[PDB]
Symmetry: D2
Subunit: 115 residues, 4 copies
């Protein structure tokens, strides 16, 4: 009805996607891992790599192997069928007061390591 | 992937549906309110009234005007287009210690007042 | 640790609180019910009635009996021990194209019926 | 109030905790990683290592470096202050028809590898 209040639950719009590179005979360099994150992001979202880079905001190849991107929960589910994907999880701040996510910063292909 | 761990969040299967009888031209007796809950439950789920009576587990005509029933989250969304429906919300315990929902208990049309 | 990412769930910042006046012998007028929402909101949030009126954004005495205000999940929990409170729930739009919650609009003490 | 129904979101009692081993100078064997998981689980839960080994049900040192244990959400929060902990997240099935979590199975110290 016009006065219906439907509860739809949590709205998670920042997601962490980790990847499994342990299989390979030859280990990927950090650059190769980040290039893989970008391709996987584009594939799961159904968008160009250029558009996917705009969604991505952080990644790591050290503390963890994965990337973090803005996407809806409905979007995150599409990653479940891609090869190499391990965790698909809402991202959470490592530093609430500054609203900072963990990992290295990612800006359209530019990584800033965060100590 | 074969190792993918997808977070899907909360899945609720106990739902509260409240009703608006303020726009009715004739005031409903308590029994007539319960009859309307049964009809609304049947219409939203696409099942018969006798089948809906099995899903319902509680209701009120005093503290609030609504009923509570077992249904999937997908089924709860079907109530959004029904006339007279106000809140569609996961039900929660009134007494968490005893895992008891609020309102009067409803068992296939037999209702028990609960303090 | 310095790298620890703890998952805690989502928060909600808009809450609907309904109230039970069915127990009342002498029925409250709509104006009296709204006065009770303002007092309850202030009591639950631990703030002045003046501040509570700034946080409330909608209410009803017809479609339902309740009020809606900006507060966190931690804040909403504090209403559980006040008299007359029935449901405490995250509020949701009734009209997403206008980003409107349900009930009448409440603007710092003034109600516009919707 | 006596009639108060406070919305309760869903609870999780299966948690996955991942760990970062890089500060340590000597790279660990898989058994040294599992020993660290047992010790971290005990410290986080505030229980003996013997009890912690009973609470764990899976772990990995390959696909990811982490362990999985039964605990409440309030318990999982205590892991946030432990050294080496990276992600603390609700665990989810990798094979939902069989209700199997990921990682290698862990039964009070006995690991069954699950590639
Ligand atoms: Br990881
Ligand atoms: Br979504
Ligand atoms: Br989508
Ligand atoms: Br960030
Ligand atoms: Br740019
Ligand atoms: Br930075
Ligand atoms: Br795979
Ligand atoms: Br959740
Ligand atoms: Br009526
Ligand atoms: Br049926
Ligand atoms: Br109500
Ligand atoms: Br069900
Ligand atoms: Br309607
Ligand atoms: Br019950
Ligand atoms: Br009973
Ligand atoms: Br949680
Ligand atoms: Br005042
Ligand atoms: Br305030
Ligand atoms: Br009361
Ligand atoms: Br809004
Ligand atoms: Br509004
Ligand atoms: Br208006
Ligand atoms: Br929720
Ligand atoms: Br769980
Ligand atoms: Br032991
Ligand atoms: Br398992």
């Amino acid at each position: 009805g016009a006065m219906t209040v439907l509860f739809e639950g949590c709205d998670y719009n920042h997601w962490l996607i980790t990847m499994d590179f342990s299989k390979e005979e030859t280990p990927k360099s950090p650059e190769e891992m980040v290039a893989a994150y970008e391709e996987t992001c584009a594939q799961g979202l159904g968008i160009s790599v250029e558009e996917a880079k705009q969604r991505m905001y952080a990644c790591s190849t050290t503390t963890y192997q994965g990337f973090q991107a803005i996407m809806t929960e409905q979007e995150s589910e599409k990653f479940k069928d891609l090869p190499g994907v391990v965790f698909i999880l809402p991202d959470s701040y490592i530093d609430p007061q500054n609203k900072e996510y963990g990992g290295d910063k990612y800006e359209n292909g530019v990584i800033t390591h965060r100590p």
